[PDB]
Every structure is written in structure tokens, then in C-alpha cells.
């Protein structure tokens, strides 16, 4: 195993390209096309194959490739979708291709045969038996190890060479016998008549080029050996472009020679012979002893348009040059034989078709896939009983350019999505080159044919789309990562350069939910906006030891993140190591996100459990309040019911506007088309109807589409004693009854326990006290049934109130009632202009 | 100063620039051309395409106070300011041009009506240039009179208009006995059935005549183009525009149908023509009832629908009546075209997008009218007329009617795809789908109008797109662009967040900790070179002063440094924060600085040049910060330029995850550092040099770097010079603590006091260190002088095991006087593929 770079690939793919085409048809091609067009069909070819060599040369050389060769190299540098797709598209074209070279042979046989007197059974069915026996000698060759193949290879090659040279031998040496049939030896006369063309059927200059760019293709058995090759590296590109340079050479040499020393029309009868009477014809035979004027009339059975097995007859020697052509059709045959199998074995190992996977067996010492060899043997024994193959030709061709093509195309995106990584080591290709090459494969298998290429487009993106939705988990980094980083990152710094605008002002949260997965519902909610028109952050702070905490956080990014996006969630999970969750907090809200995608508010899960937990955790959630405040952000405090007449808007205080924008971007939501915002205001009595009209003209300046306003002015009253009474026994607990108790003993507790709610905080505040209690009675005797309600929330200075006497508001303002938002911004947010 | 209001402003306004010239005049010829059914079609199909375009602009108008300048304003501030720009030009120049086309429309029938009789001044075209001069000198005379001035005269001319349509129907109902042989019947199902199909005799076709019609389709911006002085547009607008549209369009099919069964198509204008018998090959209507016409194709006839333009207003009665309201229709769409002409440009001109132009925008007198403006149109407009040619440029004009219909639409379709708060229309009746189909509508009917036409529409269209985009203005007003890219910004991270993390892709993502970017703009530089087009620079700067004041500073710092990063082709993020000292900030940046995957992975540090000099307490957060850092797993590069202003030399020293090797490949890949070439210095005892420069050439060629040579050193391990051990001992003295030469209890003292002094023992303890990192300093001043960046592996040592200071040392010596070294520690992460 592992072949050398001449062995492995020079001398695999210089046989693949050398088939049917070179000594049966070229000259063929050569009389309907003159030589000067012939030869410029034969370097279109050379450029499109010259172009993919590069591309697969400059894939191949970026590091070490497992196996599976141009599968391989494409699902590595492109994404594993294109990758499966091109990997089933190419297996399957060169398992047809076996079919194909063997059915070449079978009539190259048959031809043989015929001419001889016996023939078996008919044309066609001869062929089928003769195809079918071949193939079974193929599959056992191929079973019967790598090496021996390698032999057989390498001796069809030396035949192979032998035959040309002999066909060059022959040419140069003319013979008096083959005069009638068209050989002339080296007539300038036969150079200058042939050069022009003439297309006297309806082939066109379109169909000669693609009848011959099958001979082109092939180039891929070199790095479709990847797996078993000593060095991909060093092998690959060196041995493709020089076996490329050296068929190209022959083609066109092998192409002038025919063209330049047959005839274009001749017939084989002895009898036309022009003796002395040299008569007003221009015709290059005439000058040349041989008057063909029959056959401008009459049907001729040699020449180059007429005959294709001119090249056996020119030669001397012609059984060899029959041996030759045997020999080259049946190492093509062998060389896709043994190319499929492993491309859709490692197809099959990556395992981006679950239904496949009994294909990647190895049984073996070297990893051989005797059941891919099984399956290659069934399509090819079927295409070969099916025994009319030219009508599926451009099919074949067209997957090998689709494989062309997206090798090009791959080359182009690793080299556009400029990433560390990407480091080819093959000076010689370009960007432009291998786009050009991409664009060339698809405009030439259009002119192949025009229903074949739409066919291999659809089947190409079936497969794709099929991958896309059956994602398997892939660890290859290809260029499709690169570039999405490249224009997250063009796009970042584009988003930088335009100047913020308050029109455009996008809601961009901070979600200081711990684990997202623990709360969903608000999750959700706080889903409903910033979804298409706002970033989300889900910050979370982690706890414990410094350096082994980076651990952790690594998991935790891997794991919700993750979650984040099993679900239909638009949010990155920003997780930070502090001491505390002020710390953590302060890290985010201080250096969250980049460029002008930064949070604008800090969205807290209302603390429930409160009064159960620890009240240094309640200090520190109402420290995060006024930190949040103090660095211009809009606290956004939601309450759910966890375990589990529609949106209600309360614009209590004046703000930017975020507690009324919040509830448009809810509304303009799948969840919830019917909307009808229900608008309250708290207005003086003996005004409800002025501050109505006014409400209703600033609601339709900021076109938010209010169901009904309504003008509230109990909200500043003495409420009822029972929800008194029930406020005073819930903060019973943190009460600092310093009036009743000592002096001395009431500092003593109030010092070290700060948090405890002075009475004169009480005293002082026993306004706002029965303003929140009020607000929440008339809020849940009115609202009881709602969707959603949004309220401003209350603000104290800091130290100014207790925590505890804050955190009481916040929940009397919100005891029990529908899914509340209570909101509060810092800056200008909806413009009526 | 002046508030229409859709009652007068919007709906009259849009309804008399809808109807002009064709509305008579070249009626009959499409209704004849092609058969009532394919007429119908083609108002059908002008009909929708002014809709959508009218339910767009309405859309943009109701979102939000218009401000006043017409559709240049609403395609302004829903798109971008160059679209608004281009747009602006050529629909101001297109209603210019228009003017004089209605003018030229209303003096072919003056001229022809005067032919009528035989007085003719000089010459039919020569009367024609006349007559629009007068016309135009006297449109322009009326207009500058007031916005006001015309609300009654538009009014009675509309009057006037409708009076004549009611003329014609009262015509259509009533046949008359002297005029059935010049054209038509008394409204007979004969005719109806007989017109009812196509009869193109000429070389007009489809597309032809419905390029014909299509021109009194436009208009329906006039109304919108008087936003400036309108009560309220957000509701007046739509209301006005689409009525406008709906009673016009119906008005439109009522006459097609009306004359469609009335005047025979062809119409030989004989009275002795007369038939009094029935007879077979008269399959004609003509025959039916009792006038046959025939062989009007086969010699010269006079009268029918495909004949006589106004041959409606011989079937009107009392055609002085007809003929005044085809004067009304034609001189009210002038002035319609005239009054929306200036009114852009003004608005286009006062927005400073064309420095050329901004003379335009003075808007004298109290309702702000650009007279020169006025002025400009009505140049235009003569320039025009006294083409006298309008046939050949009026493909040209539709296309620019069309484009900016087009852009319309797709402004609505912009502004809908972006999502985002501040698009709030309010006007129920649209969609973005709808938007969209009318836009490409537009887009192929002016394809299919003429096709050089609106290829010269696009350039043109391209290129003042590319001229103001070049020439960006001082514009911000949060167009649909600015929402667009923030909502791409948006779902590429988020997709980003999508894909994973690998080896092959990984990227060098700095976190360059140097406050006030302009300060040092050489290393800032050095680091653009691999991180451009690679991976982000973020330039993080802590904010020193006190917390209450600090976020003024620090939006003034961030608007000022972004502003100067982008005026230099650097690309980075300028991402500041505020700290109790820098140390603090840095932990803040490099704890929760970029979102997703966008997230720094390295930290870039200047060398501390003043480190003598400064206080020593500086040097000590310096070193923790380097500490600090590698807690994070983050890679640590110090880079040391000289901040006043041969190949690249690498010193993989030290095996980390491979950063050394990566940031020199980087520089490599630049037009910068193109042509220098990787040295290689490795360490490596004497006896086995050669070994190890084969194994380090087959390492380079597993990661495909492509160095030039490798060189071994045996001696990185040898005692430096006595000179330079020395300098060394002299550059430390200042923080020397000589605890070995003094009394224990002031040694120790002066050092929990001061804690940052170089005890002894940490000498003792790290001689072979501080001499490595001389001979390394003596043996890069040797080998690697002339070298235009060195990159080496800076040493480490453990928190508290040596002294800040000591540290600080060891970073000055190795690199005294070298060219742009750039020393480098990655965090022990691969960050070479190797496959
Ligand atoms: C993708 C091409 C698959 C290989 N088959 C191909 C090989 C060559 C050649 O010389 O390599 C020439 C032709 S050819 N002279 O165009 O017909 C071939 O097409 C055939 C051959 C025989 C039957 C039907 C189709
Ligand atoms: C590691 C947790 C970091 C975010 N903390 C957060 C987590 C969660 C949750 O479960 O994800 C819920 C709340 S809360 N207000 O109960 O809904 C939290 O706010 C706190 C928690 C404790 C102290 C102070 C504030
Ligand atoms: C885009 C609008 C251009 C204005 N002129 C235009 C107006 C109307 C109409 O109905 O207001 C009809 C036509 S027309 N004969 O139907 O194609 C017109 O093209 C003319 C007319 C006469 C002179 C030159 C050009
Ligand atoms: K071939
Ligand atoms: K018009």
C-alpha cells in the first residue's frame, strides 16, 4: 500500500483520462471539426480540467487527508452537506462511468468480431454478455488486491504507450495499400484541406465538444486514491497537473497527425485511381493520385468522417493498436471501478446518510470496501444491461462537471473566507482562477446539455437540502464556519460605522436569568420582543473557585447555549465568573456585547421567595436596581406564574417611552395579533375627558393602535385597611420598631442588620406606601382578566428606603395578578417624527 | 403658513395630474388600436401598479410627521440618503420635463384647433414653439403668484374637467341624424361587438399601446409632493391619493367602454356613402344600420376611432366645450407638474446632498417657495418645448416616473424587512409582499416600454447612487439602512453563535488594552496587520475619573475614538469601560467583552517604556494584569515599538499552542510584510543541531508556514557577558532590597512595607533566568539586527514566586534597542490544524 506520486497518481489518472475517445473517435472529431477547431476543443477541455487540478492540488496540499479523496477534500474545506451531495453525486457518476467504459469495450469487441466471421447472438445482445462477463473480471480483479490492480495498471499503461507509439510509427511511414482507404503520409495539401471544418450531419461545433470532454474527465482517480498514498501531499498535485499536461499533449498531437495525413472523404475501392487524367477539380485528393468524387454523393465506408477504427487501420500492426484500445477502456473501466467504492465509503463513514452505513465496512487489511465494490458491480452491471448508454452520456458528464465545479467553488470559498487554516501550500491558484473554473464547469455543462444540467442542479440541491434538515454533528471545520465568522464580523463593523438614530432605537436586553433553562416562561415573554428587533443577552454569574471555574463556565456555554437554540430562542448566553452577583452584573452591563450592539436594559425575573431567602440576596437585587440606573439602563422587573382585556398599558410616570414601546413589540407578534392595548393614565378627576384627549393624541403621534384609554384618579386615596393591615404584617419581619424598644438595643440590631426598615422610612413614605397598595387594589379589581400588564415600575433614591421596604413595594404593587412587566427606561425611545 | 388639507390639496391635486392630454385625445386611439376587452386590461394593469405605488407612499407618509419636500422626503428618511438623493434628482428633472410635455400636448392642440381654421402665424412647428413658450411663460407667471393663488383656479378647472365629462356622456346617450356618417353610432350592440376585439393596423402593438396609455397613469405623487404645506398629511395623504386613484381609473374605464360602442374603428367621412338594402360580405357593423364604410385601409380615409384623435370630441356635443376641457386637463397637469418640480428640488437642495447645488433652497416669502427653484423648472420646461421633439425623450421620462415609483415600493418593502420599532405606518391597507410585486412591476414595465430607455434610467440612477454614497453627507436621521444593518449585524451573530469552534478555523481575537487609540498608533498598527479581514481588535480603555460623570466622558470618548478609528482604514471596536483602576477594567473587558462567539481570546499589551520612571505601583498592576490574564486562558503579546515613527525573525523558544508561529504567518499575509520571509531561531545543544533543524523543518511543513531557513543556537544556555550582567545589576538597583547585606529586621520592614522589592533571594534563586534572558537580549542584537519584526516567546513565572519588578526587568532586557520586537505567550490551546 501507500503508492508513490507516480505509481499512486500520475500513473492511475493519465490511464483514467486515456479511454474510448483517444483511439477510436478523436479522429473522428478531428474530420467533423477541422484540425484548428478540433485542437481548440481539446484545449477547452485542458482549461476547465486544468483549472479543477489547481483546485483539488491547492485542497489537497492544506494538511493530511484521511481517505475518500475528493470527497474527502471537498467535506473538509466545504461544508459536510455539499460535501455528502457531491460525495453521492460522485460515487454514482463514476459507478455509471464503469458501465460506461465497459460497454465501450463490449462494442469496441463487438466490432471486432463482426468483422471476423462469427458473431454470438446480435449486436446489442453480444454486448450486454460481453459487458457483463468484463465487469465480472473487473470486480475480481479489484477484490483481488490493491496491488494487483496497481500491476494491471501499470501494464495497460505500457500497452497503452506501446499503441501510440506504434500509431506515430506508422504514421510516419506511408503504405501503397492504404492510399484507396484515405492515408497519405504528412501532405501539407491534406493539413491545409482538413483544417477548415465541416459539419455535414446536424453535430455542431457544441456537440463535437461534448462528445469529447468525457475524455477529459477522469483527473480525480489520482486523488481519489487518498487513502491508500504514501504522501497526499507531495503525491497529489504534482503527479495530476503533469498527467494532465502529458494527455493533453497526446490528444493534440495524436489529433494533428490524423488530420494532417488522412483524408477527410475516401473509398476503399482500388478502381478510383487518377492516371494522367488530371481533369478542373480542386478537391485536396485530386492533387494527390486518389480522386474521391464519389463520395460527395454516394455513401463511403473509410475516411475520417466515415470511419472510426481509422486509427487501427493507419497504424502498422493493427491487432496492437486494437490491443491498445482494449487496454486503455479497460483501465479507465477499472480506475472508476476502483474510484467509486471509495468515495462512497468514506461518504458512508462520515455517515451524512443514516440509510447508508453497511457500506463503510473494511474488510480487509487496508480498509478495502468489499461491499462498496459489490454495489459498483450491481449499477454497473445494470447500466450495462440496459446496454444504450448514449442517451444517459450528458447525465454522467454533467455530474462530473457538478464534482468540477464545487471543487472549483470550494477552493474559492476557503480563499474568500479568509481564516488562519487555510494555508495550501501550492503557490500556483488563485481566488479568480477557481471562480472562473466554477463558472466554466456550469456554463459547459449547460451547452452539454440543457434538461441534464437542471437535472443535476435539482438532484444537487435535494441532497443539500436533505443534509440541512438531517444535520448530522460534524467536528471538520469548513470554509462555510470561516465565513459565517467573516461576515458576523464585516457586518459587526459595518453596524459600527452608522450613527445611533432615536427612531431606530432597538430594545436590547440583558437577561440576568441564572440558568435559562430554569425559567422559560419569561424567557419566552422576554422573547416576545427582542426577536428581529433586538439582541437578548441571557448573562449568568458563576460561583466558586477562580481558576477551576473556567471549567464549568466552558460546559455551561456548550450546554445553554445549546438549548438556546434547540429552541426558537434568538439570544447568546454571556456568562461571567465574580464573586457576587453584583460583580458578575457590573462585568456585563459594563462590557456586554461590541460595537453599538450593546444592552440598553436589564431585564430581572422578579425576585419571588423573597422573604424566605437570605436579605443579603434582597439587598443585592435592589443594589442591582440602582446599579442599573446608575449606568443608564432600563430595568424591565416581569412576574409569571412559573409552574404554568387582554394587554393592559399603565404609563403611571413618564419615561423615553419603553414602557409603552415594550407593549407594541408584544403586540406585533404571532402569539398575539389580537392585541387591543388597554391604556390607563392617572389623571386628576373633573380632567379625565382633557388628559383622554390628550393621551389619545400622543398614542396616535406614536403609532401604537390603543383598544380604549381610560383615565384613573382613585390612584392616589387611602385604600382599604385590610390590604393596610396585610402590607404592615408582611414587613412585620423587617420592621425596626425603634420607638418601642431601647435606643441603644434598636442601634445595636439596626447597625450590624442595615437592611432593617427604620420608622421613620415608614413615616416618611407612608404616601407611596398607600400608593402602591392603592395601585395594586384598583390594577387587580379592574385587570383581574389580562394577558399581559405593564406598569412604571417604583424608584427610590439609593439609601434614601430599606431594601426591604422597596422590595415590599414591588411586591404589594404586584401581589397577585395576571403576567405583569413592570418598566422603566432612561432616554428618548419612540419619536414622533 | 398654508394647510389644505386632503379635501383640496391631496385629492384635487392628484386627481388633475392623473388626467391630462390622452384623457380625449389619444383615448379613441388605444380603445380602436386594441379592442375594449385588451384596453380594459391595460388600464387594469396601469391601474394596479398606480395603486401599489400609491398604498406605498402612503404607507411612508403615515408613518410619523413628513416634514415637507414632497416623495423626496418619504423615499429620504424610509431609505437611505443617497437613494433619497438620486431619487430626488431624477424625479424633480422628470416632473421639470413633464411640465413642458404637458405645455407642447397643450399647444399640438391649439395648433391644431387653429388649423381647424386658417389663421397660422408662421409654421405648424414654429406655432407650436410659440404657443408653449406663451403657455409656459404664463404657467410660471400664475404659479408664482402663491400656493394659494391656485386653490381656486385648480378647483374651477377641475369643475370644468368633470363638466366636460359629463358633456361627453350626455353626447354618448343622444345620436344624432346629421352625424352618423363621420364616425359613430347611436350607441349600438353592433358596434360593441364589432370593437369589442384587437385591431393593431399599424406597426403598434401590445406593449406599444400600452407604453401609449401608461403616461396619464402617472401623477398621483403630485398630491404628496405638497406635503410642505398641508394640515395633515399622515391622514390627509392616503385618503386623497387613493380615491384619487379609484374615481379616476373608474372614470378611465367608463369612457373606454362608453366609447367602445360608439364610433366604428375605421370611418370614411362620405356623406353619399348609403346602403338601402341588405346584402351578404358586409359582415362590417358599418352596413347594420345604415352607413357603410369600406377600403379606409386601401385609400385615405378621414374619420373612426384608429383615424381621428378627436373624434370623441365630435361625438361630444358642443365641442368648444370638449376643446376647453382638454385645455383644462393639459394646463392643470402643468401646473400640478410645476408645483411638485420645485418643491423636491428644494427639499433635495436643502439637505446639502450635492454640494453643486444650493442656491435652490432659499424659499422666499412666508410659504418658504423656492423661487429659483421656479425659476430652474421653468428653463427646463422652455428648453424643452423649443425641442419641440418629445416623442423621442418620452420613454426616458416614464422610465424616471417608473423608477422612482419602483424605489417607492421598495423603500416600503425596506423598511418592512428591517424590523424595527419607529416603522409604525399605521395604514392598515398594505403589504410587504405587495410592496415588493409593485416595485419589480415597475421594474419590468419600464423594461418593457424601451429597453435603452431604462438601461440609461439604471446608470444614471447607479451612478448618482455611487457619487453621493462616495461623498457621504453629514446625514443622520436613522433611514431603513441603518435598521437593515443592524438587523443583518443581528442574525449573522446569531448564526455565528450557531456554528462551533475548531482548531482549522480558529482566529486570533485581541483584546488590545490601550486607551486613547491615537496615543500609540504605530502599535496599534502592528496589530491591525494580523488581525485585518482575521479575527476583531477590540481597543479597550478604562475610564479613570469619578463614577457620576464618567458616562458623559465616556460617550464623548467612544463617539470621538470610533470617529477616528473609521476616518483610518483601521477595523476595530472601540469598547471602553470604567474602573477603580485599570486593572479592574481590564478583568471587566476580559470577562464579559463580545457576545457569542465574537469574544477575544488574546490580550495585546504595549511594553511599559516609562516603567522606570513611572511608579513602581503601576508596574506592579502591569505584571497582574499579565497574570491576570493567563487565569483566563487568554494569550499574553507584548508588543514594543519606537513610538517616534531584512526579514522577519521568529524565536520559537518556547512551545505554547502555537501563537508564535501564527501572528508571524499573519503578517506575512499582508502587502505590508509581503515580501519578508519567516527566519526561524530554535534552541538546541551543539550535538544534535542538525536533527533538530530537520525536526523543525518537518514541523514547518506539517503547518504549512513557509519559512526561509531555520538557524539552531547552542548557546541560549551559556553565562552572558560581564558588561551586560552589569547593566543589569545597575538598571535593578533602584528596587534592589539588600536583605543579605543588612539587618534582617530592616530588611523585612522595607519589605512588607514595600512589598515590590527585589529580595536577594529571588536573585539567587533566578540567576540562570536573568542571564538566559541577557544572552538571549545580546545574542537578537547579534544575529537578528537587522530584522523588521522579531517575535519571541516571553518567559513566565508563577504569581508571588518573583517580584513584579524583577519581572519588569527581565521584559526590559530582553529587548534593548531592537528594531519592532513583538513578544509573544499563547494559552497552551492548539491553534495549528496539523491536518
Ligand atoms: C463521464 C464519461 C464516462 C466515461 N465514458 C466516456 C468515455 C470516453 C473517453 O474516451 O474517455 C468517451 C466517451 S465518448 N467517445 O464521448 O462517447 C464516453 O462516453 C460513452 C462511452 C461509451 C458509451 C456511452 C458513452
Ligand atoms: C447564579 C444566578 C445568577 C442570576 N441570578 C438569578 C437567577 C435566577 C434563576 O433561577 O435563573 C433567578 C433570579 S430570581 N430574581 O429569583 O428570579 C436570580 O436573581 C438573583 C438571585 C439571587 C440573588 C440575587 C438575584
Ligand atoms: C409621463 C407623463 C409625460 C407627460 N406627457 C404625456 C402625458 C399623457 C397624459 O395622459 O397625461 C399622455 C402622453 S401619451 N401621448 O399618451 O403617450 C404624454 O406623452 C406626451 C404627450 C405629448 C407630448 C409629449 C409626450
Ligand atoms: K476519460
Ligand atoms: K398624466
Known sequence: ?????????????????????????????????????????????????????????????????????????????????????????????????????????????????????????????????????????????????????????????????????????????????????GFFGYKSEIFNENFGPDFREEETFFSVFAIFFPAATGILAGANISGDLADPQSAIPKGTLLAILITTLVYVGIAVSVGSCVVRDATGNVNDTIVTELTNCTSAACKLNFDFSSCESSPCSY????????????????????????????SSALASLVSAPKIFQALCKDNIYPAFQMFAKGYGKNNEPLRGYILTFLIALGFILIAELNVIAPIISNFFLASYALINFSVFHASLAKSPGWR??????????????????????????????????????????????????????????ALTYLNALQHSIRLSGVEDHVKNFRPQCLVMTGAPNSRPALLHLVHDFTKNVGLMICGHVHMGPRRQAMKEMSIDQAKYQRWLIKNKMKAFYAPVHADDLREGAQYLMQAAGLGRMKPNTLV???????????????????????????????????????????????????????????????????????????VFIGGKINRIDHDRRAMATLLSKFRIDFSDIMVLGDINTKPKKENIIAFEEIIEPYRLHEDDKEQDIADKMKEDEPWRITDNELELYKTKTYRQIRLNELLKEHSSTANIIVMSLPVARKGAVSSALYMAWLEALSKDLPPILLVRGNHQSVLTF
Not at 470527497?71 to 457531491?86: K, M, N, Q
Not at 437540502?465 to 471538520?476: A, L, Q, S
Not at 440576596?617 to 406564574?641: E, S, T, W
Not at 408584544?666 to 392585541?675: S, Y
Open 604 to 678: 430581572l425575573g422578579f425576585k419571588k421567595d423573597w422573604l424566605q431567602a437570605d436579605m443579603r440576596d434582597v439587598d443585592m437585587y435592589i443594589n442591582l436596581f440602582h446599579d442599573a440606573f446608575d449606568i443608564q439602563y432600563g430595568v424591565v422587573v416581569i412576574r409569571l406564574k412559573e409552574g404554568l382585556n387582554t394587554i393592559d398599558v399603565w404609563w403611571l410616570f413618564d419615561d423615553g417611552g419603553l414602557t409603552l414601546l415594550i407593549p407594541y413589540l408584544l403586540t406585533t407578534k404571532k402569539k398575539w395579533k389580537d392585541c387591543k392595548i388597554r
Open 424 to 481: 495550501p501550500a501550492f503557490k500556483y491558484y488563485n481566488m479568480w482562477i477557481s471562480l472562473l473554473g466554477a463558472i466554466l464547469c456550469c456554463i459547459v455543462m449547460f451547452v452539454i446539455n440543457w434538461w441534464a444540467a437542471l437535472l443535476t442542479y435539482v438532484i444537487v440541491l435535494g441532497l443539500y437540502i436533505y443534509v440541512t434538515y438531517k444535520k448530522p454533528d460534524v467536528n471538520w471545520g469548513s470554509s462555510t464556519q
Open 303 to 330: 475516411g475520417l468522417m466515415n470511419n472510426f477504427q481509422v486509427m487501427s487501420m493507419v497504424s502498422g500492426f493493427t491487432p496492437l493498436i486494437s490491443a491498445g484500445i482494449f487496454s486503455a477502456t479497460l
Open 1 to 181: 500500500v501507500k503508492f508513490g506520486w507516480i505509481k499512486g497518481v500520475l500513473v492511475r489518472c493519465m490511464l483514467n483520462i486515456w479511454g474510448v475517445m483517444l483511439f477510436i473517435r478523436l479522429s473522428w472529431i478531428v474530420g467533423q471539426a477541422g484540425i484548428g477547431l478540433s485542437v481548440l476543443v481539446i484545449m477547452m477541455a485542458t482549461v476547465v480540467t486544468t483549472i479543477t487540478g489547481l483546485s483539488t492540488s491547492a485542497i489537497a496540499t492544506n494538511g493530511f487527508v484521511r481517505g475518500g479523496g475528493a470527497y474527502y477534500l471537498i467535506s473538509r474545506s466545504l461544508g459536510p452537506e455539499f460535501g455528502g451531495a457531491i460525495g453521492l453525486i460522485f460515487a454514482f457518476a463514476n459507478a455509471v462511468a464503469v458501465a460506461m467504459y465497459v460497454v465501450g469495450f463490449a462494442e469496441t469487441v463487438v466490432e471486432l468480431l463482426k468483422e471476423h466471421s462469427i458473431l454470438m447472438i446480435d449486436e446489442i445482445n453480444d454486448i450486454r454478455i460481453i459487458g457483463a462477463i468484463t465487469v465480472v473480471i473487473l470486480l475480481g480483479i479489484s477484490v483481488a488486491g490493491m496491488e494487483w490492480e496497481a500491476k494491471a495498471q501499470i501494464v495497460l499503461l505500457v500497452i497503452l504507450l506501446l499503441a501510440i507509439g506504434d500509431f506515430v510509427i506508422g504514421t510516419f511511414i506511408p503504405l501503397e495499400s492504404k492510399k484507396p482507404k
